């Protein structure tokens, strides 16, 4: 349940991904995210009108070779964000840098 | 040459009008140069401007019955100059009022309303009054029956243009296709479910056959006998997204501000 959250780029999960993953019924699946806040393993809160669970805290947990690289490419991708939005602002007013 | 292209006309052959015309190009530009174009009127140069008007009228009727309307336009628009001026002294004519009628199908059925309606006011202050309207009537009528959206009104109209099988009926066709697709554009935003008898309906057809004909050629996906516009709205709406006008088409929030900023420095 840590694992999955903490790997995507979003922060929610929907209770049938849940559901799949950890091989258990739908009552159970929403009393381990219960169990698991309660731990302070996850945080957040919780909708089961949306059936999500949305994360805003991850505990900190083993690096390996594997975890290593899936952090790293989160970094160029908002990297390119960075890069060619300072271009279009150096292009705009130019007249005016003093 | 000159007067066997009047007697073509009348048996009731037109392409051999269209055989003979470039010949008679030739002597076109030896009639013009009789008349001083225009600058005073003679009874001498009427004979002459009699000639001048003949060639272009018979010309021009006959062209739309073989289906060149490229080459129909280019004949009306000579005779243009004898149109605008001299009236009530050999301008004005039976056959004018039936020429200027199929004209102003033309643009109509070109689908230029810009054109069509700026062409009427050059006729407000020729015949419309002078020659009351009875063939003039026609166009204006389909015109304005599209504008307020009725297309019940505007087919009617061209269903009994069609009963008239004489060079009229060559507009009319094109004109009811042109409803067909004015109801295409709009069905997009109307609906998102018809049956397949409910497009048949609105589309005019006869046919369930023929609508779905018509569903290929204009990309409508007929899927169990239902259409699903909200598809269609999507590929039209990537294709404006694509194209270059982007940025201030949008217009980013970072955008807005450096517009300010740099206004206040300068």
């Known amino acids: 349940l840590i694992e999955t959250v903490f790997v995507k780029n979003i922060r929610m999960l929907s209770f049938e991904d849940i559901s799949k993953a950890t091989h258990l019924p739908k009552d159970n699946v929403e009393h381990l995210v219960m169990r698991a806040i309660s731990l302070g393993l996850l945080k957040g809160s ?37 890069e060619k939005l300072g271009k279009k602002m150096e292009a705009r007013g130019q007249s005016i840098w003093v | 040459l000159t007067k066997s292209l009047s007697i073509a006309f009348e048996n009731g052959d037109y392409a051999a009008c269209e055989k003979l015309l470039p010949p008679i190009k030739i002597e076109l530009i030896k009639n013009n140069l009789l008349i001083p174009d225009l600058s005073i009127q003679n009874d001498i140069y009427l004979n002459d401007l009699m000639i001048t008007k003949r060639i272009l009228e018979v010309g021009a009727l006959a062209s739309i019955q073989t289906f060149n309307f490229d080459s129909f336009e280019n004949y009306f628009n000579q005779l243009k100059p004898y149109y605008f001026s001299n009236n009530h002294k050999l301008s004005e004519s039976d056959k004018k009022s ?94 998102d479910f018809l049956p397949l008898s409910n497009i048949k309906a609105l589309l005019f057809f006869n046919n369930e056959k023929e609508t779905e004909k018509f569903a290929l050629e204009r990309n409508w996906p007929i899927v169990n006998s ?21 940025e201030d088409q949008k217009t980013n929030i970072i955008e807005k501000a450096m517009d300010y900023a740099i206004s206040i420095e300068n």
């Not at chain 2, 504008?147 to 094109?174: H, P, R, V």
């Not at chain 2, 598809?231 to 270059?244: I, R």
Request: aromatic share 10%; net charge negative.
């Open chain 1, 46 to 82: 919780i909708d089961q009108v949306n059936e999500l669970v949305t994360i805003s805290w991850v505990q900190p947990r083993i690096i390996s070779g594997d975890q290593i690289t899936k952090m790293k490419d989160r970094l160029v991708e908002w990297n390119d964000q960075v």
């Open chain 2, 98 to 191: 039936k020429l200027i009628s199929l004209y102003l199908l033309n643009l109509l059925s070109q689908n230029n309303t810009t054109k069509f309606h700026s062409e009427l006011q050059y006729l407000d202050k020729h015949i419309k009054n002078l020659e009351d309207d009875s063939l003039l009537s026609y166009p204006i009528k389909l015109d304005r029956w599209l504008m307020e959206g009725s297309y019940q009104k505007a087919w009617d109209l061209l269903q009994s243009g069609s009963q008239n099988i004489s060079e009229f009926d060559s507009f009319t066709d094109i004109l009811k296709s042109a409803i067909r697709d004015e109801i295409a554009k709009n069905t997009e935003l109307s609906y």
């Open chain 2, 226 to 246: 239902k259409v699903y516009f909200n598809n269609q709205s999507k590929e039209k709406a990537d294709y404006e997204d694509e194209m270059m006008h982007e």
